[PDB]
């Protein structure tokens, strides 16, 4: 049984502290977040049907204090509805606090707060790129395994007011009907190839005509005409995805038919990128707020 209010209070009380300060939840509280959120994820569709207004964010990658700033600008749940597009952990310094606050908000406000799966919400990936090490250092391996069980149940895509298709990575040459996404059974790992892999790993590319091999070595690239055909076939207006660092935190593709959102400013302390958050109002007017890193 969770005391979700106590948990959220402790996660938020480090606001304003010298950045890097940890929240020390009890192991059983974190396990509790994983178990309860898994129940909620499985009870909701794997392809979410959402209504505007809401705010949409891309990659967070453990940048907890930047996540807190996103909520300060966007409004703390449930003042605003949120959809996150995946990649909550790895690379950054505070993945545990990041995923714990996100799961806590999912549990407290399950119809106002939504999380999609990113390619880092995958044991084979986050074992390597930081999350496993963080779990091992602060708790133990068993807790990392508990997170994996939770991540294996995250929904994969969302459609906002029947017009905006959202997922972490991108399109798939295997995808002919949304029903194919709906028939993916959870829990599941991410496969090395196939529909679910593509939805989490693929990228748009201005220099490809049709589909191409992705330079990453996983999945595909797709061109602007692929986007156009997808939108026309499914009566959609916009693809909203994440999965690529972009200078200004958001970047359009194919004459604004696709947008990439990335919400982790100065990613890895390497990229000097802004993080962006997209607001969608009830009329589906989209606007951007961007967090620019400064000295």
């Amino acid at each position: 049984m969770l005391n979700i209010d106590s948990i959220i209070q402790r996660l938020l009380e480090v606001r304003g502290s010298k950045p890097g300060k940890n929240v020390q939840l009890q192991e059983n509280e974190i396990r509790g977040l994983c178990l309860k959120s898994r129940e909620i994820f499985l009870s909701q569709p794997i392809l979410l049907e959402l209504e505007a207004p809401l705010k949409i964010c891309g990659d967070i990658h453990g940048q907890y204090y930047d996540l807190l700033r996103l909520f300060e600008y966007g409004g703390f749940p449930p003042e605003s509805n949120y959809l996150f597009l995946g990649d909550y952990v790895d690379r950054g310094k505070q993945s545990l606090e990041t995923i714990c606050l996100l799961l806590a908000y999912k549990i407290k406000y399950p119809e106002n707060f939504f999380l999609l799966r990113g390619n880092h919400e995958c044991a084979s990936i986050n074992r390597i790129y930081g999350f496993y090490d963080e779990c091992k250092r602060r708790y133990n391996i068993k807790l990392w395994k508990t997170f994996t069980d939770c991540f294996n149940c995250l929904p994969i895509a969302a459609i906002v007011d029947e017009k905006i298709f959202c997922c972490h990575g991108g399109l798939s040459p295997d995808l002919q009907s949304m029903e194919q996404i709906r028939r993916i059974m959870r829990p599941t790992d991410v496969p090395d190839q196939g529909l679910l892999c593509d939805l989490l790993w693929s990228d748009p590319d201005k220099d490809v005509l049709g589909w191409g091999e992705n330079d990453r070595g996983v999945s595909f690239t797709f061109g602007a005409e692929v986007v156009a055909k997808f939108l026309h076939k499914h009566d959609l207006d916009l693809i909203c995805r994440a999965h690529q660092v972009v200078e200004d935190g958001y970047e359009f593709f194919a004459k604004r038919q696709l947008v990439t959102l990335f919400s982790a400013p100065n990613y890895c302390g390497e990229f000097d990128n802004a993080g962006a958050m997209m607001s969608v109002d009830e009329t589906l007017m989209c606007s951007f707020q961007i967090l620019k890193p400064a000295e």
């Binding site: 967090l291 620019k292 890193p293 400064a294």
Partner: peptide, 20 residues
């Protein structure tokens, strides 16, 4: 309903995000 975009972007500066 139709997706549209506001041209005005709201920008914020986050101090300390360089050299965390």
């Amino acid at each position: 309903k139709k997706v549209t975009f506001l041209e005005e972007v709201t920008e914020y500066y986050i101090s300390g995000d360089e050299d965390r």
